[PDB]
Design a protein around this ligand. Structure first.
Ligand SMILES: CC(C)c1ncc(Cl)c(C(N)=O)n1
Length: 166
């Protein structure tokens, strides 16, 4: 049962114009089996457009490649991002957590997606009561990208709504 191809793709921006299908593949094959690897080029001049994409055999291989950033490919630090579901942000909205969810509930769950920098449990401006939603800020966008493509998030027994924030 193969994961959907879209979830196995990495868009690589910031390429050296000298990077080729072959040199992009040789680099990113260090972190998994590549079923596809393409440098985008102008149709007339064949000059690189400065970006391309690689497709791994599994999502765990995508994770391995992202965890090995920064990637210097043919002498240039490139910018890998998971394919769109790009709104590149480090913060999520977490809704549906009700009044009994605390900081440690959110931390213990979300810390396995990435390094957390801020947890903000929202409270009512007048009463101080919890409003039932929170924001979590990570040190990097790939955490958010992994989070929002999941169908489900269960935190503190609550089925939560999670979206990219701002
Ligand atoms: C009131 C709820 C719907 C809300 N407030 C703020 C944000 Cl930033 C989001 C979101 N989906 O990102 N959702």
């Amino acid at each position: 049962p193969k994961e959907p191809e879209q979830l196995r793709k990495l868009f690589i921006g910031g390429l050296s114009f000298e990077t080729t299908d072959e040199s992009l593949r040789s680099h990113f094959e260090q972190w998994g089996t590549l079923t596809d690897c393409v440098v985008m080029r102008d149709p007339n001049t064949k000059r690189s457009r400065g970006f391309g994409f690689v497709t791994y055999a599994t999502v765990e291989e995508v994770d391995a490649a992202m965890n090995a950033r920064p990637h210097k490919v043919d002498g240039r630090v490139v910018e890998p991002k998971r394919a769109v579901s790009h709104l590149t942000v480090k913060k999520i909205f977490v809704g549906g957590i009700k009044e009994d969810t605390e900081e440690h509930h959110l931390r213990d769950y979300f810390e396995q997606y990435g390094k957390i920098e801020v947890i903000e449990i929202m409270t009512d401006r007048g009463s101080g009561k919890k409003r039932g939603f929170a924001f979590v800020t990570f040190d990097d966008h790939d955490s958010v990208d992994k989070i929002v493509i999941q169908k489900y998030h269960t935190v503190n027994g609550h089925n939560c709504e999670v979206r990219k924030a701002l």
